């Protein structure tokens, strides 16, 4: 029997605006005699909702089970123990997790780089690329919005954290969202919305616009009439 | 006692300019009583040279097996085998490779982006950016040059091949060169060569510098009438 | 009986992306008594493929047989040798062959330069030269391409490679196409590819157009 209980991740946390754990068993053969429970250090029992899923190839099943704990308990670090209970089990199965203390924290610098231009002549399709480097460790979400609207997942993709080459510790990711050619030329403009634990207001901003860095341009006419 | 052949990838035979051939064995008790054969598909025998590694901490060990083939044969389409006999295994184990057929050919686009100009206000470094888009199927080799010379595969991180949603079958992939600002500002010139079977002459480069896309600021029109 | 077994150039295995062997034979009374096969160092059947030509003016058959080869077998430095037997020889004819070694590698310098302004005001035609110049040893391929495409052979004539007087060792080539003047007149960018065994990924590129020369910061301009 696999018993796994992972940590909430901070790109979920910050998605459903809820804490949620988890405690994943699977290698089940009875799924009417599991039971799934957390607790705090005193051992006070916690409201735990356990789901049953399907049948798994390997004639195994699986129990999940989940709570709703305030951000305060899991930020603090405190201890939280799942207790899995089954008829082919001689003892519990119990696992101890918490936040590892000496993380490093820089707030993230963010980039957004407008479409080349030779790659908009030949009227297919604009890039827009919002670099994200320098943070630590690696929880970075990264979102799109428009005029105010969030934009849907599936326009643009997210790569994973990578390290730095010449700075260790620090890390980097980006994405790119792809636009028609006539959006683009009517004049919309597009943002990238960065969420980052060390940020100082947890949230920072970029936008980009076809009007943009353009330089001051000079038009002199000379008639010189002796 | 698992046995895993790894099959060449474009990038290796393109870098070492020959067709390598990896038959990894794991999970051996005894490094004293291992035969790892090559063994083309007619029956003709291929030289393996045998080279053992350090003892993993979890009691195993594993080998190395490599065999040189000319590369013109590893595209004809006909199958290898590497043989590995063991007193612990009652049978050898054997295992098929060859080059799959049946994926679309198509012509990586590479485009060059300059570093933002928030980061050069910041004078710190610049960050200049190879993206390649738009190619199937995924394999593919980026490397940078300046001034003729190569450099140093330190220098730069590069990202695996990402499906794109808008393009099915089709992927993207980006590469990121970090410089300091002093020697940007100088006017160096950097490319990144990008290696594809897709292409007829199977490189491409594109070349970038601190003068580039510059529009015209001025517009004069001397007029007279004599 | 002459026996020729030329080596296969650099300029053949780029275009075809294959090392191919030859064998020419000339002089040949009875082409039903021919037989050309080669062999490795040391001794193998090599599969060839024997093919026979026209009968010469002066009364002479010819034979020609091809080996295909694993490019690396013949640059690793191993010698062969091409068997010829007929009735009228009492001995089989054996030449061997080789590439030299111990040459000095220089990288080809690339540069591209547009037409002279009076062919163009002569309204009729142009010429696009490429100059490859100081590399060593002699074995260049330069092709062009339009719009990524590559242009018929009838457009382009390149010169064999010369001796450079200035430096010792060195040469020096280039082609010329010639595309009329409606066709330069629209901005059409043209490129120029040359193959070399020294560059580090044997192929280098370039490229011309009207704006290639044209200052960009200002445009000044007369209205008359
Ligand atoms: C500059 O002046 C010329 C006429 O001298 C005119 O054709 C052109 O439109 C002017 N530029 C702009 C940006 O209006
Ligand atoms: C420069 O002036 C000419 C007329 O002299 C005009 O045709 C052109 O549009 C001007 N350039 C710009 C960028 O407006």
Redesign the interface.
Known sequence: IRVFAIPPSFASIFLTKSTKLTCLVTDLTTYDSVTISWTRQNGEAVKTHTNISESHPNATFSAVGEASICEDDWNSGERFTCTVTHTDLPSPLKQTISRPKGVALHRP?V???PP????LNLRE?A?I?C?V?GFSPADVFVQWMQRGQPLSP??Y?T?AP?????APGRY?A?S?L?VSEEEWNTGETYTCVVAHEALPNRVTERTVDKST?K????????????
């Not at 080349?116 to 790659?119: D, F, N, S, V």
């Not at 990578?162 to 010449?166: D, G, I, K």
């Not at 330089?215 to 002796?226: E, I, K, Q, R």
Request: no cysteine; net charge negative; proline share 8%.
């Open positions: 610098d980039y957004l780089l080349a231009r030779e790659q399709s890039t690329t670099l480097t599936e326009k993709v790569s990578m390290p730095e080459p010449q980097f980006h790119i792809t860095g330089p001051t341009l000079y038009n002199v006419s000379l008639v010189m009439s002796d």
